[PDB]
Amino acid sequence: LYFQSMMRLPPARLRNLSVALLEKRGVPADSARLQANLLLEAELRGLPSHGLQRLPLLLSRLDKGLANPTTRGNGTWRRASFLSVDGERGLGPVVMMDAMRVTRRILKETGLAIAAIRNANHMGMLAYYAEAAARDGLIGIVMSTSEALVHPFGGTQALIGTNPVAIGIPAAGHPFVLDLATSIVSMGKINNHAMRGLAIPPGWAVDRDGRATTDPHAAQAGAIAPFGDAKGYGLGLAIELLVAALAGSNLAPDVNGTLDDIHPANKGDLLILIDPSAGAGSIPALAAYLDRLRLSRPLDPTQPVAIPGDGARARRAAAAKTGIELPQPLFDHLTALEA
Amino acid sequence: SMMRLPPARLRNLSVALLEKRGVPADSARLQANLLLEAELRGLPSHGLQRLPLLLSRLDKGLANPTTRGNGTWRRASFLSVDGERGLGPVVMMDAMRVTRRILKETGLAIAAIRNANHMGMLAYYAEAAARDGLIGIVMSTSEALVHPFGGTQALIGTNPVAIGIPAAGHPFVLDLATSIVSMWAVDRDGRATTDPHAAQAGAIAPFGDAKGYGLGLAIELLVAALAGSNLAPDVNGTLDDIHPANKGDLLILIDPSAGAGSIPALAAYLDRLRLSRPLDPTQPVAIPGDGARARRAAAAKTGIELPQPLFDHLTALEA
User: Fold this and answer.
1) Chain A closest CA to B124's CA: distance in Å?
2) More exposed terminus of chain A, fewer Cβ within 10 Å: N or C?
3) Recorded GO terms, molecular function (chain A) (predicted)?
């Protein structure tokens, strides 16, 4: 069936297509490439919820003056270690990476710094930034909020964002890279189900009335559960409050501009960088410890203990080889936009 | 065999026992208060039960009665602390006092602590910061008691993290360990068990499957990288009275007035959640901190329950 069909394509082809579409909107080539890399990396790593299905909305927001194609954001040092960034409606990854460049400069002096971003568009997959920090030998902690999509533990109304946090930590070779939504599932993933006419496992969501549902279209208008029960809720809510307080963005119930092309993006993002060299520990000792964990007694011998970031790396390597699978309707959509 | 006592009687008894060993009054009250607040909030695992062990550690020099630690500013916002074997709460509150002074200049600071004794309940420090109009993020490592997701060996500490956020009134105070339960479980053999005694020499699961494991591991790594403490497998001195404590602690303080947001807007938003549609009309949505406060008020009214052996042991010590 059409809406359930897939195509497999070479990553380079999709990247080129994505860049050309961005560029048709006046987005600078370096920035176009970066926004495209964010989505392609998501696709390659098995996170299609934050991959190319995100693109048409950004393209639309650009065409409509809701997204600013050239700005890289405007940062002000409010204190020695605190960068306040007005995104100026810029593309998320462009504003994030610029904030990282600026905050990183200060780390030599400060050891710890934070950039608090408002008025920027959707960040996509936060692992991208956590990983970039880690590859530069830094500890990177990243947060972003969203439209109210998640109900509290014990509640059934959408009041909290999907609120991912990502943590990058330098290891020897491959960095420790943690990226997790505090919701039990992404709305992006639910949309993909709705799109393809698929049911969703029970427990993901409730409908608009608060009744448990397996219907993705119902779920779309409903609320998603937190992961890890009261603890995951605690964490999602902490993130919500930290982002608002520091970034000065809106709380979830007032948030739009990520899943629509009508309203200003008014969610927030936080980036915290830390220079491990200011610390008293040993990055190489971290490496040996992670190796130890990988070789420790598995519950299942066929499935060795993994470190956050292993799976994503294994999936990326395989997709770069075999190609990316995306829904045919999405491919036709981008293709129409191309022409 | 249980008994119920006024908190003030327990506080007084704890303080005397500490002072007996050369702990200055204010430090003694603080350390005392750490255990009492844990009792009042229904967390006896971090309460007076821990007191005999600390008294023994003080008498052995594994705990130093006077030190507040020695801190060194490595960077503009980075304080490295040598706990010098001080009491956990004493070292931690001093680091908070010290890093707080720089916030008007820097907006943000972190204290990385090694060589300090057990911190007790992290919520205490998160709340302290939040009541000072500050955001506080606290974490601590411990003996390896937790197995990785997909693994059966105890290789990771229980690795709690607490987060306090000011909220014009009752602060948001989240305190969460990254294991499913406090010392479900396997081992020593790595075999699933429903037997407590076997669990004790076993390994506890992370909460939230892979995600909770990820968080517990991240905590493990951050603390060791920054504080220079030992990884979980090599950690001692928290559950025993024979080894120097070699786990680590982190404190992050952030001044919200450096941010572009609004604490008052946070409070209205939390109220809105409390008033939202519950799964059960009888059990309204709660904000982290709510249950602890309610338990505390209840206990302050009805007194604290503790085993008679513990109390008899402590009272014999005070005499």
Assistant:
1) 17
2) C
3) oxidoreductase activity
